[PDB]
Amino acid sequence: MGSMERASLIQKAKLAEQAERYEDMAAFMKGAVEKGEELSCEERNLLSVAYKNVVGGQRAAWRVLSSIEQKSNGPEVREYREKVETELQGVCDTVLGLLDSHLIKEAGDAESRVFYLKMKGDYYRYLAEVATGDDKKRIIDSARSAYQEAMDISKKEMPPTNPIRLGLALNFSVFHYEIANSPEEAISLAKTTFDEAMADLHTLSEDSYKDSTLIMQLLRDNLTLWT
Amino acid sequence: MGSMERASLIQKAKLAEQAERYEDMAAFMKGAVEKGEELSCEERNLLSVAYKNVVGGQRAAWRVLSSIEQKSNGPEVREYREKVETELQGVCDTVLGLLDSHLIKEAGDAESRVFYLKMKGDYYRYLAEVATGDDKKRIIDSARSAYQEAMDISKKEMPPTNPIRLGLALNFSVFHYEIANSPEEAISLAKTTFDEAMADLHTLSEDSYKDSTLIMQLLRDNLTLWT
Amino acid sequence: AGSIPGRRS
Amino acid sequence: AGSIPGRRS
Numbered sequence: 001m002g003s004m005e006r007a008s009l010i011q012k013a014k015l016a017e018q019a020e021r022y023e024d025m026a027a028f029m030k031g032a033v034e035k036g037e038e039l040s041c042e043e044r045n046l047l048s049v050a051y052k053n054v055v056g057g058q059r060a061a062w063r064v065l066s067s068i069e070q071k072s073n074g075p076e077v078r079e080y081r082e083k084v085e086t087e088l089q090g091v092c093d094t095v096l097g098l099l100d101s102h103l104i105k106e107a108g109d110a111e112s113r114v115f116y117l118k119m120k121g122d123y124y125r126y127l128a129e130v131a132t133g134d135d136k137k138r139i140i141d142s143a144r145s146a147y148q149e150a151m152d153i154s155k156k157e158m159p160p161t162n163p164i165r166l167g168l169a170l171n172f173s174v175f176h177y178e179i180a181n182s183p184e185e186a187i188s189l190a191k192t193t194f195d196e197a198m199a200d201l202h203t204l205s206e207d208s209y210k211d212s213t214l215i216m217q218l219l220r221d222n223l224t225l226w227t
Numbered sequence: 228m229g230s231m232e233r234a235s236l237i238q239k240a241k242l243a244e245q246a247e248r249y250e251d252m253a254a255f256m257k258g259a260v261e262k263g264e265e266l267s268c269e270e271r272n273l274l275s276v277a278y279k280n281v282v283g284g285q286r287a288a289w290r291v292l293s294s295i296e297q298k299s300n301g302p303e304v305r306e307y308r309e310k311v312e313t314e315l316q317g318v319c320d321t322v323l324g325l326l327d328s329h330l331i332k333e334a335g336d337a338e339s340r341v342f343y344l345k346m347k348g349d350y351y352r353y354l355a356e357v358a359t360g361d362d363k364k365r366i367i368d369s370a371r372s373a374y375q376e377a378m379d380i381s382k383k384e385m386p387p388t389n390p391i392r393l394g395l396a397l398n399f400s401v402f403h404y405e406i407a408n409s410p411e412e413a414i415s416l417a418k419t420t421f422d423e424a425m426a427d428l429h430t431l432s433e434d435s436y437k438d439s440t441l442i443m444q445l446l447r448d449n450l451t452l453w454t
Numbered sequence: 455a456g457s458i459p460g461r462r463s
Numbered sequence: 464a465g466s467i468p469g470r471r472s
């Protein structure tokens with residue numbers, strides 16, 4: 001999107017979100033990132049929403065096809081699952097490439113650096129969901145490493161109710177439960193995250209309280225399912 | 228999709244429908260059509276479902292963007308509406324090309340010929356929804372002509388409860404109301420269609436009765452909105 | 455005003 | 464088990 005203005009790319013990403021055109025949204029925000037400037041808080045959210053929707057559709061389709069394939073065990077179901085899988089891996093690789101060139105290395109503030117590292121953990125986690133070969137373990141460790149670095153920064157630099165800190169802990173707990181086969185670590189992280197947020201709620205305004213309690217409910221929903 | 232077997236294309240179109248991957252579905256069924264054989268009843272439905280979903284997403288997005296554009300009256304909203312509009316027109320042109328090369332000319336039975344001509348009316352109607360220039364009237368007449376030929380055949384060759392005959396009349400009535408500025412023609416067609424179907428229901432099995440009464444309800448829903 | 459949904463089957 | 468939906472805003 002090299003011939004489009006950065007501001008036009010951002011404005012069109014917002015329009016694509018309104019039209020529920022998430023592939024367009026992602027391409028516009030990919031173009032905005034490749035302009036080389038850092039992203040604002042709002043712009044980071046647009047980037048994240050766009051690719052979460054795109055990969056979310058791919059993951060949902062992959063699970064449908066993987067389920068059909070497992071029940072069947074001609075080549076068509078496997079071939080088509082492989083096609084969707086390859087397209088999903090390409091989207092994850094694209095996002096990871098944006099983070100590596102050069103969003104993360106230019107992110108100096110806690111809010112931006114933790115946001116991008118959480119992203120990095122998430123997209124390695126999506127790669128891990130479909131991984132089966134020689135690199136499943138290496139992909140899992142890449143996800144863990146990104147989440148862990150984000151955790152370390154957020155615990156040092158953000159309050160326990162910060163929505164990015166809470167969403168990071170939520171997703172890392174899902175990583176532990178669903179990917180790393182560590183349900184006790186998942187439950188422990190979710191419980192400690194919830195309890196430390198609850199004790200900090202008194203410091204918040206009405207609007208910040210709503211933002212934080214929304215994500216604490218997601219932690220509670222998982223604990224209810226896991227225990 | 229020239230190197231894939233016809234049967235594999237059909238099987239993968241069914242898988243894509245299950246995965247809600249309608250762009251893939253449409254491409255698979257485009258490949259199946261271009262094999263050059265006629266389509267069975269089931270295969271025609273797959274072709275229709277695939278492209279209805281694809282163009283349905285494009286139409287929904289175009290309406291969102293057109294609404295934003297009308298409220299605003301920089302170039303970004305118009306530019307992005309034009310992009311979506313061009314992509315929608317390309318999908319309609321693709322479907323119309325499949326009908327013209329060579330689905331319609333090889334369709335000799337009433338069920339297949341009326342099905343394809345209804346399709347032809349529908350995709351010209353979608354072109355008419357976004358048309359504004361020198362060819363709006365010609366596109367509208369192309370839609371009308373296709374629907375009319377389909378109507379003439381269906382009245383001669385199908386019973387009044389036939390679901391294709393009913394869906395054709397439903398969509399032609401929407402054409403009259405929404406495109407041709409003929410609400411009285413729309414209401415008259417929907418009423419006569421409903422009444423003649425109701426009088427033929429006694430001839431049907433339990434399953435055929437369910438198929439027909441489902442579409443008669445849609446006719447009634449429109450009449451309720453129009454009167 | 456609704457045309458036939460036609461998006462499932 | 465739910466991650467953050469993250470698909471709106």
Ligand SMILES: *Cc1ccc(S(=O)(=O)N(C)C)cc1
Pocket residue numbers: 045118163164166167168211215467469472
């Ligand atoms: C990963 C993540 C955490 C928090 C949110 S939020 O909806 O609360 N917000 C944009 C701060 C989104 C995503």
Ligand SMILES: *Cc1ccc(S(=O)(=O)N(C)C)cc1
Pocket residue numbers: 272345390391393394395438442458460463
């Ligand atoms: C245009 C159209 C008419 C009828 C149907 S149906 O769902 O009843 N069927 C596949 C016969 C679909 C589309």
Ligand SMILES: [Ca+2]
Pocket residue numbers: 005006
């Ligand atoms: Ca510039």
Ligand SMILES: [Ca+2]
Pocket residue numbers: 232233
């Ligand atoms: Ca063959």
Ligand SMILES: [Cl-]
Pocket residue numbers: 079080083239
């Ligand atoms: Cl395939």
Ligand SMILES: [Cl-]
Pocket residue numbers: 038106107108109
């Ligand atoms: Cl910086």
Ligand SMILES: [Cl-]
Pocket residue numbers: 012306307310
């Ligand atoms: Cl554009």
Ligand SMILES: [Cl-]
Pocket residue numbers: 265333334335336
């Ligand atoms: Cl024939």
